[PDB]
Amino acid sequence: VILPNNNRHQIFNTTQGHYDAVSFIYIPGYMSGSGVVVGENEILTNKHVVNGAKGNPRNISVHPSAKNENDYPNGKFVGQEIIPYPGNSDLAILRVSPNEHNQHIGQVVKPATISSNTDTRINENITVTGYPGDKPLATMWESVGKVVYIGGEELRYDLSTVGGNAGSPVFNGKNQVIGIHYGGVDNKYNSSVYINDFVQQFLRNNIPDINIQ
Numbered sequence: 001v002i003l004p005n006n007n008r009h010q011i012f013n014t015t016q017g018h019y020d021a022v023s024f025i026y027i028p029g030y031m032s033g034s035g036v037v038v039g040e041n042e043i044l045t046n047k048h049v050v051n052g053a054k055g056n057p058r059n060i061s062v063h064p065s066a067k068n069e070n071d072y073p074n075g076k077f078v079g080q081e082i083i084p085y086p087g088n089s090d091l092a093i094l095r096v097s098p099n100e101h102n103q104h105i106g107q108v109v110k111p112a113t114i115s116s117n118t119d120t121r122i123n124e125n126i127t128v129t130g131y132p133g134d135k136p137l138a139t140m141w142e143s144v145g146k147v148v149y150i151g152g153e154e155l156r157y158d159l160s161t162v163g164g165n166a167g168s169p170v171f172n173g174k175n176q177v178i179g180i181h182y183g184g185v186d187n188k189y190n191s192s193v194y195i196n197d198f199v200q201q202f203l204r205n206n207i208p209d210i211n212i213q
Contacts, residue, residue, distance in 0.1 A: 001184035003145075006160040011129065011140040014065040015073050018175035020109035024066035024131045024138045025167065027052045027059055032137065034130030035094065036169035036177060037064050038114065039207035040106040041080070045167030046090045046182045046193075050082045057082050062096050064109045069137040077105045083206055089153040090182035091193040093206055106209070112169060114203065114212045115176035117195055120155075122147050128159055128181050128190070130168025148189055155179045155194035176213060 011019050021037040025045060031052045035045035043062055053059040057079030063072045077096035085091035098104050129142040145159025155170065161181060170179035170192045179192030193199065203210045 001186050001190060002160045002162065003158055003187070003190070005145050005158050007144040008132070008141050008160060010135070011142055012067070014067045014140050015109070018112065018171065019129065019140065020065045021112040022065065022129050022140055022169060024063040024140075025049060026061040026063070032131060032133060032164050033166040034164065034168040034181070035062065036112050036167075036180070037105050037109050038111050038177070038203070039209050040104050040111075041095050041098075042207045043094050043096065043105070044169075044180050045092055045094055046180065047084050047092045048090055048182070049167050050092045050094055053079065053082070057094065060094060062094065062105065063138065064105060066131070066138040066140065068139050072138070074108045075099055085193075085199065085202055087153060087198065089193040091180055091199065111209070111211060113176045114195055114200070114210060115172055115174070115178045116200070116212055117178055120147070120150065120172065120178050122150060125173060126157060126159070126178065127171045128157070128161055128165065128168050128192075129171060130165045130181065132162035133164030134162045150194060153194050153196060153199065155192045156189040157192070158189060161190050
């Protein structure tokens with residue numbers, strides 16, 4: 001949702017630095033979302049995003065580092081298996097197949113570093129980076145703000161997001177993923193799945209190369 005803090009800027013060097021793992025999701029109209037590469041064959045996104053495929057992961061296209069609708073520098077990877085988080089939060093792993101050159105998604109971009117969240121606190125400056133639907137299709141935007149709430153598996157912030165941002169990584173100042181954006185409440189806050197210790201266990205047990213720091 002759009003909040004009084006609406007500080008959003010387009011990313012152009014989408015294959016460089018921590019942006020390469022940020023991914024555009026397209027599911028045939030169409031729905032679109034966001035996600036983040038975190039392992040050799042794996043992205044994180046929302047349940048409500050992968051649910052749009054109606055049980056067929058092959059309906060999901062993942063474009064890591066997408067720059068615009070005519071510029072997918074790392075091509076696409078097709079959904080292979082949906083692994084929902086068992087807990088009551090909007091988090092899923094999407095395992096993708098290798099591409100047409102037999103490259104794995106976590107070989108073409110550097111998988112994102114996950115935060116242990118040992119230091120994460122309210123008032124901390126963060127970003128949410130992904131593919132908002134008010135902007136041109138498949139353009140990457142970074143939104144700037146602060147954490148306002150941490151509780152259980154919920155982390156909320158005062159920065160603006162728009163439909164299409166679902167699944168976007170929430171980055172701390174070290175460019176580590178602290179949460180996965182899922183939506184918000186008009187005029188109040190936006191919300192993410194907080195990567196707490198239980199979420200970290202789920203990641204380790206499904207993504208053996210997960211990099212938690």
